[PDB]
A paper describes a structure:
By deliberately weighting and altering the conformational dynamics of a putative Precambrian β-lactamase, we engineer enzyme specificity that mimics the modern TEM-1 β-lactamase with only 21 amino acid replacements. We propose a detailed mechanism, according to which selected substitution mutations are applied to GNCA, which gradually drives its dynamics (DFI profile) towards that of TEM-1 β-lactamase. Indeed, we observed that mutations in sets X and Y, when combined together, bring the dynamics of GNCA closer to TEM-1 β- lactamase.
TEM-1 β-lactamase degrades β-lactam antibiotics with a strong preference for penicillins. Sequence reconstruction studies indicate that it evolved from ancestral enzymes that degraded a variety of β-lactam antibiotics with moderate efficiency.
Residue numbers in the entry: 28 to 58, 60 to 238, 240 to 252, 254 to 294
Write the structure that this text describes.
């Protein structure tokens, strides 16, 4: 059955696997290690953009505000921000770069505007997420040390938080649509879930990678004629190489989505 398939993939990986598939209309789920902690890595950028939009909703932030910065602020993996030292970038451009190209300096600039990792965590508490925590900046938050609860979530919490943000009322309708639009425009990690879906299925997603053999993805998927589903998949402490880790996430995603929809 499914749990046996996942345990076998987990043992082939040498690591820990966590998954939630959640029906946003019914709350029905497939869960595997749903109550354990895993590192968020770049999937936190989805929550960061949500927090920014919530500040916009409240009149405390402006998507057109231009932020300036220097070459000395750039960290690893900053493909967009490294091009705009001279002219700056708007909050919206930074949100877009952070989600769609996983730009790390863009995430750090938005985190700074919010007030830091503690301010993002306080936002998540404010919307009912008691578990998820951000402690560090990019790229240190990708360390994924075993047993380290910094910068982690639980799959069940991430999925429920995404349900609240994308289909609840924590954000205005306009901010909700903007957040979906950025996730739909994501350009990295397409091997992990998008490659496996029919072309008429809608998907917004954000992937992450880290040390200690870690890889993950979060997604909102709209099947035709169906309520959207939230998929969150984690792998950490894995012992296989980067390509095998991608393949593990992809096969988990194939199995769990099929199992969820073949609920007959």
């Amino acid at each position: 059955q499914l749990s046996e398939q996942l345990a076998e993939l987990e043992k082939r990986s040498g690591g820990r696997v966590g998954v939630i598939v959640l029906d946003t209309a019914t709350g029905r789920r497939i869960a595997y290690r749903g109550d354990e902690r895993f590192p968020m890595m770049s999937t936190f950028k989805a929550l960061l953009a949500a927090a920014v939009l919530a500040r916009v909703d409240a009149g405390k932030e402006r998507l057109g505000r231009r932020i300036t910065y220097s070459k000395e602020d750039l960290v690893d993996y900053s493909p967009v921000t490294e091009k705009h030292v001279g002219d700056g970038m708007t909050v919206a451009e930074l949100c877009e770069a952070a989600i769609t190209l996983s730009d790390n300096t863009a995430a750090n600039l938005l985190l700074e505007a919010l007030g830091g990792p503690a301010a993002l965590t306080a936002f998540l508490r404010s919307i009912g997420d008691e578990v998820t925590r951000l402690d560090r900046w990019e790229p240190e938050l990708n360390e994924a040390a075993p047993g380290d609860e910094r910068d982690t979530t639980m799959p069940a919490a991430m999925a429920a938080t995404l349900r609240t943000l994308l289909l609840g009322d924590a954000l205005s309708p306009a901010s909700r649509q903007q957040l979906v639009d950025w996730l739909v425009a994501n350009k990295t990690g397409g091997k992990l879930l998008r490659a496996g879906l029919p072309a008429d299925w809608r998907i917004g997603d954000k992937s992450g990678a880290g040390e200690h053999g870690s890889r993950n993805i979060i997604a909102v998927i709209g099947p035709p004629g169906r309520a959207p589903i939230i998929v969150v998949i984690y792998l950490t402490e894995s012992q296989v190489d980067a390509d095998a880790r991608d393949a593990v996430i992809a096969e988990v995603g194939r199995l769990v989505v099929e199992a969820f929809h073949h609920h007959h």
